[PDB]
Every structure is written in structure tokens, then in C-alpha cells.
């Protein structure tokens with residue numbers, strides 16, 4: 113499994129043993145179609161292979177992650193759906209078991225009822241709801257990985273307030289400095305009010321065309337912009353036909369290019385862990 | 397232009413002459429990828445051909461409609477973007493002119509700042525913002541057509557409160573009775589509080605596979621369910637490779653299948669007008 117990857121996992125497990133509860137990671141950005149749900153699926157898959165105990169959370173009406181995971185894993189309907197769990201103030205009956213390692217709180221269209229549920233609440237109580245209900249679950253997991261909508265909403269606010277770390281997938285050529293700074297301002301707003309320890313892991317570039325001069329050049333410029341803070345991931349995600357195959361048939365390892373495309377996701381995953389480890393080692 | 401279509405347009409213009417201001421139409425549903433933005437583009441295109449004076453409103457951070465329209469029309473940047481117009485309490489400087497008939501308020505990523513802007517406002521003042529700023533513009537247009545996000549949010553609430561009629565595109569096989577009723581409950585909530593005259597035009601089926609037994613059968617069942625209220629459109633939208641061509645190159649009429657795919661959109665458009673006319677003829 114490579115020595116360096118083994119060392120990263122040992123270090124993760126050591127940090128988790130010090131923390132004594134899960135680290136919560138959010139994949140988020142306000143553009144659709146940049147691979148947030150796909151990264152989430154591939155992280156679920158990889159963590160299960162690595163025997164990490166993980167809770168995936170699909171906080172999207174569309175339930176994209178849930179339906180995608182169901183291509184590879186047996187995904188049951190939960191006794192109580194995510195929206196009803198939130199309404200009941202307990203998420204315990206909303207968890208399904210994909211493997212002995214991998215759990216999921218599935219998405220449901222009933223999440224559309226959430227903003228009405230919380231309409232009369234204080235902004236604080238609305239925004240802290242997910243965090244409050246995740247708190248008792250964290251001792252049961254190594255990682256909790258949240259996927260949600262791209263539109264600023266009750267969903268995004270809950271996800272951000274519940275998380276320790278945020279991964280930001282984006283297409284460099286589609287974003288401007290202003291876009292990124294505005295998005296970061298949104299995170300800062302919620303961090304200061306409700307979640308001061310929130311950290312950005314970094315930006316995860318998505319490259320839809322490997323033979324595009326403008327795509328290459330915009331990516332170069334993003335790296336330049338973030339030379340000092342080092343926020344741009346060194347390992348990136350490239351569009352692959354293989355992902356389309358896995359989205360139809362389920363994820364496999366025994367076919368041509370399966371292991372090569374898997375290593376692309378693995379390299380992002382491990383870079384994410386490295387970045388988390390560095391931040392955790394710095395921490396209080 | 398066919399006699400029956402000419403009669404529908406005369407009747408529209410007669411109704412608009414009685415109203416003395418634009419009718420506002422919203423394409424909305426809480427599932428992504430069902431052709432809301434595409435229908436909006438095709439309605440912009442068709443109305444321009446018919447010399448109807450139309451304001452398109454792209455209330456989406458992703459600006460999908462805006463970028464799509466820019467394939468066919470010259471789309472300038474507005475002096476003041478949509479978010480800043482909302483913040484300034486005037487949308488007049490946020491309008492661009494695509495043709496002598498067709499105007500657009502373009503989408504902008506800066507719309508992400510809206511929920512923070514309105515955070516301290518009453519739910520009423522937050523929800524009525526778009527309607528309030530559209531009011532002075534309506535005398536200048538025959539139709540105002542709004543496209544927005546699929547996620548329940550400040551955006552959806554503003555769009556719904558501003559509109560006279562809602563068109564609901566969906567894939568029948570992807571929805572359940574519960575989904576539709578829950579969505580309709582959301583409309584009802586805002587209708588009762590802020591917009592009692594709001595009418596649903598109907599459901600516009602999107603068929604992604606013409607050779608699918610389950611897709612056909614789910615569509616049949618939806619029609620059965622709505623036998624009495626007649627809410628399901630008789631004219632539907634089918635997936636077409638041509639739409640992919642127009643999305644890359646712009647809309648054309650001089651190529652193979654151009655006019656056939658255009659008539660598909662035209663038939664939905666005219667059915668929409670028929671349905672609006674029937675409701676208007678009933679009205680106060």
C-alpha cells in the first residue's frame with residue numbers, strides 16, 4: 113500500500129486517537145458540476161478499502177451521492193429519512209450501513225421542507241442544527257464526510273457550521289479572484305459566528321479538457337496567486353471517461369484504466385489527509 | 397405562422413392590453429437537470445421571433461441561462477449586476493438588450509451575497525424583494541420569464557413571490573406523488589402569505605429516453621393522476637441531440653432537424669399561452 117501512505121494513515125489514526133471523535137470534512141463550492149458529489153463517492157469507496165470507519169452525509173434534495181453509492185454498495189432506505197431525523201432532533205435512525213466500515217445518511221427530497229421547519233428559529237439555532245445532531249455520533253466514526261447543494265441556503269449553512277475542514281473543488285478557468293474571495297467571505301461569516309476553528313483544506317482543481325490552452329493557463333495562474341498560502345492541491349482531478357462507466361455500472365478495480373483513475377482519486381485523498389494532519393499537528 | 401397560433405397571440409395581446417402590464421412566468425421545480433434553463437432559453441428565442449417584448453431574468457449564481465443565451469445573442473455585461481441592483485433597490489441599470497424585443501437581467505455569482513443581505517429583514521420583506529423591484533418594470537414588457545436555482549432558498553422564494561404563473565418541468569419516472577405534493581405545498585405556503593393569485597400552469601414532462609418502457613409508463617401514470625385537473629402538458633419535451641448542438645454553437649434554423657426540434661419547443665410555448673389565456677379569461 114506504499115510506505116508513505118501507510119505512514120499517513122498511522123498519523124491520521126494517532127490524531128483521531130488524541131481527538132477521540134471523528135473529524136468532519138465538507139466538500140463545498142457554489143458552482144454546480146465540479147465533482148463535489150463524485151469526490152464524495154470516491155472518498156467513501158477509498159476509506160472503505162482502507163478500513164476507516166466513515167459516515168457519509170448526503171444533504172441534498174437530489175440525493176446524488178446516495179444514488180451514486182447505490183451503484184457500488186447495497187443502500188437500504190433508512191427507517192427515518194434525513195429530514196424527519198432533523199425534525200425529530202435525532203439522526204440515529206437515519207443511518208444505513210453500506211459495509212462494516214461505511215455508513216450513510218441518505219439524501220431525500222423531503223429535505224425541501226427544512227427551510228420552512230426552521231423559519232421561525234433564531235439564525236443561530238437554524239445554523240447549528242446539523243452540528244448539534246452530529247455531536248453524539250462523532251465518537252462512532254473516524255471521518256464524517258458531508259456533500260450538499262451548491263446554492264447558499266439552510267443546507268450550506270448547516271454543513272459549514274458542522275464541519276472541521278472544507279475542500280473546495282472548482283474549475284480554475286470558470287472562477288475569478290472575486291468569486292473565490294466572495295465564497296471565502298461566506299465561510300468567514302459562519303466561522304466567526306458559529307465555528308471559529310473551521311479550516312479550508314485547499315482548492316481542488318477539476319480539469320475538464322487536458323488539451324486546452326486556456327484551462328492550463330488559468331490553472332497556472334491560480335497556483336501563482338496561492339504561492340504562499342499553498343491552498344491549491346498539487347494533485348488534481350481530470351475528466352475521465354472511466355468515471356462515466358463507474359456512474360453507470362458501479363466502481364470496479366478489475367478493468368482497464370480502473371486502477372489508474374482510482375489512483376487519481378487516491379492522490380487527492382492522501383493529499384487531503386496530509387493537509388489535515390499538518391493543521392491538526394499545529395492545533396490546540 | 398398557422399391560423400390557430402395567430403389567434404393565440406392575438407388573444408394574448410388582448411389580455412395584456414386589459415392588464416396593461418407584463419405577465420410574469422416562472423419555470424421552477426426542485427430537481428436539477430430537467431430543462432428549466434433550456435426551456436427559458438427556447439422561450440426567449442421564440443418570443444423574439446414572435447416580436448413579443450420580453451424580459452428574461454436569470455436569478456442563478458451559475459448564470460446558466462445568461463451563458464446559453466450568449467451563444468445566440470450578443471449579451472453585454474450590465475452596468476450594475478443583478479445582486480448590486482437588488483442591493484440598490486433598483487433593477488433598471490441591470491438590464492441588457494439582446495434584440496429590439498428581448499431583454500435580460502443576467503445571472504452573476506455575486507447573487508451568493510443575497511441571503512446575507514436580507515438576513516436581518518422580516519421574512520416578508522426578504523421574500524417580496526424581487527416583486528417590489530419588478531413592479532416598475534412590468535409596464536415595459538409583454539412577458540417576464542424567470543429562471544432560478546432548484547434548491548429552496550432566498551432565490552426560489554423571491555422568484556415564486558414575483559410570479560403570476562409557474563411552469564413545472566420534471567421527469568415523471570424520477571418523481572413520486574409525495575415529491576409533487578411536497579413541492580406544491582411549498583408554493584401554497586408562499587401563495588397564501590404573499591402572492592394569493594399565483595397559478596400553476598402545469599407540469600411539463602421531460603423524456604430523456606424515447607425507447608424506455610418505464611419512462612413511458614411513469615408518464616402514463618402521471619397523466620392518469622391528473623385526469624381531472626388536466627395539469628400535465630399534452631405537449632412534452634424529449635431529449636434531442638440537436639439541443640446539444642445549439643448549446644455549443646447557438647440556435648439555428650437552417651440545419652437538418654433545427655425546425656423540427658424548434659417546433660417541439662414551440663408546441664410547449666403555445667400550450668403554455670393557451671393555459672394562461674384560459675386562466676386569464678376566468679380572472680377578476
Ligand SMILES: Nc1ncnc2c1ncn2[C@@H]1O[C@H](COP(=O)(O)OP(=O)(O)OP(O)(O)=S)[C@@H](O)[C@H]1O
Pocket residue numbers: 142143144145146147148149150151176260261262349350351352353355356359428
Ligand atoms: N473526473 C470526472 N470525470 C468524468 N466525469 C465526472 C468527473 N467528476 C464528476 N463527473 C461527472 O460530472 C457530473 C457532475 O459531477 P458531480 O460530482 O455530480 O458535481 P457536483 O459538484 O456535486 O454538482 P452539484 O451538486 O450540481 S453543485 C456527474 O455526472 C459526474 O458523474
Ligand SMILES: Nc1ncnc2c1ncn2[C@@H]1O[C@H](COP(=O)(O)OP(=O)(O)OP(O)(O)=S)[C@@H](O)[C@H]1O
Pocket residue numbers: 144426427428429430431432433434435460544545546633634635636637639640643
Ligand atoms: N430537450 C433536451 N435535449 C437534450 N439536452 C437537453 C434538453 N433540455 C436540456 N438539455 C441539456 O441538459 C442539461 C440540463 O438542462 P438545464 O435546462 O440546464 O436544466 P435545469 O433544470 O435548468 O438544471 P438546474 O438549474 O441545475 S435545476 C443542459 O446541459 C442542457 O443543455
Ligand SMILES: [Mg+2]
Pocket residue numbers: 148149150176259260
Ligand atoms: Mg453534487
Ligand SMILES: [Mg+2]
Pocket residue numbers: 432433434460543544
Ligand atoms: Mg437551470
